[PDB]
């Protein structure tokens, strides 16, 4: 089997992407944030504290003839950005882009943090990291991909995120029309539960390429590109007036600037992020200070190849017995 679904930016900055997901019988379609940096499929629901729901579409398990309480199971997650959610668990039928999994754990939120409430466009998350990170207790549950894997034509999914435009998540096949040149594959460590890999270096603009190993995670659920302070400083030094602002919480730059590109290495191959992808707009409405899309990972504890990086590529998440990651230009 295969599946193919369009993913759409939630706003004009590409802060996140939402993908429609069918849950239950008859289908309840919710727009979920597909997140290769976590492993829980959780939704706003009829059980979510009423004051914490503000415009989201909810899953109502009592209206699904295929829903079953997963008795005794609870979940609780905290994300790298400080947001969180928790609740109980149902199993139900879940379909993405025509690919159907029966008995998928659907984690129903009883509580969500304010950042989730405040984002009306995101009805929940669909985790695509390794199932070892799933938070359900006392019986850990499998991701949608893990459940689908054996049925797929090939045990892969691909992320093709758009810049200020829709893109595509495919399951079970590689669309050879969706990228240019060849796909370069690189080793993955699953030791921390992430799609963790090592970039071979970087360049800023038309500058020379610096060969250096940068361990990080491929994370569709993180907006920005978070890299070591040395790398980030080298980038912003090429933008007149750019500075790190402790009050704002990262590098800002004059909105009048033209940003240089940023290149990262994948083996001997190179992925070029155009300068415009690095612009996250005014820090507040009307400001002439703009927020940068490349930020320091210092104090995160890990480098994160988030959407800024991934949307410059066609990315293969190869879930074979020994997983790997592939990147192509597009």
CA distances for 282 relative to 14, 120, 147, 222, 301, angstroms: 14, 21, 42, 19, 27
Q: What is the dihedral of CA 141, 142, 147, 149, to 10 degrees?
A: -160
Q: Which residues contact 152 (CB under 8 A, 6 or more apart)?
A: 1, 2, 99, 171, 172
The token pair that represents 52 in the structure block? 């914490």
Active-site residue identified among 14, 35, 92, 279: 35
152-158 long-range Cβ contacts below 8 angstroms, 24+ apart: 152/1, 152/2, 152/99, 153/1, 153/2, 155/318, 155/319, 155/320, 156/316, 156/317, 156/318, 156/319, 156/320, 157/128, 157/317, 157/319, 158/314, 158/315, 158/316, 158/317
Beta strands in 228-300 (DSSP E): 243-245, 250-254, 262-266, 269-273, 279-282, 289-292, 294-296
Cα distance between residue 196 and residue 218, in whole Å: 7
Active-site residue identified among 64, 199, 296, 297: 199
Note if 35 is an active site residue.
Answer: yes
Report strand pairing: 28-35 vs 17-23: antiparallel
Q: For residue 150, give the DSSP letter.
A: G
Catalytic residues: 35, 199
């Amino acid at each position: 089997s295969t599946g193919s679904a369009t993913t759409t930016p939630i706003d004009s900055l590409d802060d996140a992407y939402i993908t429609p997901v069918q849950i239950g019988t008859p289908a309840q379609t919710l727009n979920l944030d597909f997140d290769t940096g976590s492993s829980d499929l959780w939704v706003f629901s009829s059980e979510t504290t009423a004051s914490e729901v503000d415009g989201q579409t909810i899953y109502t398990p009592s209206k699904s003839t295929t829903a079953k309480l997963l008795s005794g199971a609870t979940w609780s997650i905290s994300y790298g950005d400080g947001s969180s959610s928790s609740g109980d668990v149902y199993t139900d039928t879940v379909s993405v882009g025509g690919l159907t999994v029966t008995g998928q754990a659907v984690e129903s939120a009883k509580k969500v943090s304010s950042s989730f409430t405040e984002d009306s466009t995101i009805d929940g998350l669909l985790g695509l990291a390794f199932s070892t990170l799933n938070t359900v207790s006392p019986t850990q549950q499998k991701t949608f991909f893990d459940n689908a894997k054996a049925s797929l034509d090939s045990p892969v999914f691909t992320a093709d995120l758009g810049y200020h435009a829709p893109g595509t998540y495919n399951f079970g096949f590689i669309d050879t029309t969706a990228y240019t040149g060849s796909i370069t594959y690189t080793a993955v460590s699953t030791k921390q539960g992430f799609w963790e890999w090592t970039s071979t270096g970087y360049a800023v603009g038309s500058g020379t390429f610096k060969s250096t190993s940068i361990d990080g995670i491929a994370d569709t659920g993180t907006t920005l590109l978070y890299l070591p302070a040395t790398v980030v400083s080298a980038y912003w030094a090429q933008v007149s007036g750019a500075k790190s602002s402790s009050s704002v919480g990262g590098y800002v730059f004059p909105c009048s600037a033209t940003l240089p590109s940023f290149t990262f290495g994948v083996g001997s191959a190179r992925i070029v992020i155009p300068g415009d992808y690095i612009d996250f707009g005014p820090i507040s409405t009307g400001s002439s200070s703009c927020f940068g899309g490349i930020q320091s990972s210092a104090g995160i504890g890990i480098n994160i190849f988030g959407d800024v990086a991934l949307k410059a590529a066609f990315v293969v998440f190869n879930g074979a017995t020994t997983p790997t990651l592939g990147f192509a230009s597009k």
